[PDB]
């Protein structure tokens, strides 16, 4: 036949907020819907990320607490430390961020001390509001992991006295779709990915395919390892 197509990955159409369109141009006329489904189902379930897993505010003992001059309660601050999109580097795997101010306005996500390796993606994410001038300090802990599901999870052991546990959403992908187009003797797979910002579309989709191939590679031998 000599009609062996092997698809190549591309990044047509960078659109929207954090929305893109990956594309796999030469596909072998039947194998495209399989790849669309496997990509959509592995992106939305197996990708790893980083998030805040524990916080320690200074003059605060528990979560059902309150600070002076601050317009929020700790239950509402720990709720904003969940929308902070962080981007770790290669082999850190764990670290403690630090925040400390003495201003009199909206504290933001941009106010974390500049650690190397960390990078906050959404910088105008409100964290707290100080209505009068005062000193506001907290230490968030960042970790890597994936959404392993509700029951099985990590209990997030606490060490100091004011430690509060935050439950993280590690996956960076928010919404996937796909489509398949006809070319004649080949087809075009077209993926739509929407991320939070801490990963790029090509790297994401090739990580998905790496996972899927490592899964498929057990049926080529019918052997355990």
């Amino acid at each position: 036949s000599k009609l062996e197509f092997v698809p190549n990955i591309q990044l047509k159409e960078d659109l929207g907020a954090f929305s893109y369109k990956v594309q796999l141009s030469p596909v072998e006329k039947g194998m495209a819907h399989i790849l669309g489904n496997s990509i959509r189902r592995v992106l939305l379930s197996s990708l790893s990320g980083a998030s805040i897993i524990k916080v320690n505010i200074a003059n605060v003992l528990h979560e059902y607490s309150t600070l002076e001059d601050v317009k929020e309660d700790v239950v509402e601050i720990v709720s904003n430390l969940k929308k902070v999109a962080i981007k770790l580097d290669t082999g850190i795997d764990r670290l403690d961020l630090e925040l400390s101010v003495n201003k009199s306005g909206v504290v933001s996500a941009g106010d974390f001390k500049t650690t190397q390796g960390v990078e906050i993606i959404n910088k105008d994410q409100p964290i707290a509001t100080l209505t009068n001038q005062r000193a506001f300090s907290l230490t968030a802990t960042v970790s890597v992991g994936r959404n392993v599901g509700i029951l099985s999870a990590i209990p997030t052991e606490l060490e100091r006295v004011g430690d509060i546990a935050v439950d993280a959403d590690f996956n960076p992908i928010k919404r996937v779709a796909f489509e398949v187009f006809d070319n004649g003797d080949s087809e075009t797979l077209e993926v739509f990915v929407k991320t939070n910002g801490t990963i790029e579309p090509l790297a994401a989709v090739t990580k998905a395919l790496e996972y899927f191939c490592e899964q498929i590679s057990v049926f080529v031998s019918l052997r355990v390892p």
Partner: protein, 52 residues
């Protein structure tokens, strides 16, 4: 703010001190909990499906 009866009451004659303790917990929805809408339709949650 301190003008009590040393217990803000008689403290149950025969009893010296009464101490109270408050405990708070957060509860997520799970299979078994009952849900409903404003139109007369109720039902019990059977499964939490993954999103894909």
């Amino acid at each position: 703010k301190k003008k009590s009866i040393t217990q803000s009451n008689e403290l149950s004659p025969g009893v010296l001190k009464t101490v109270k303790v408050f405990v708070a917990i957060k509860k997520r929805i799970q299979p078994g909990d009952k849900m409903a809408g404003r139109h007369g339709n109720k039902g019990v949650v059977s499964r939490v499906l993954p999103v894909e």
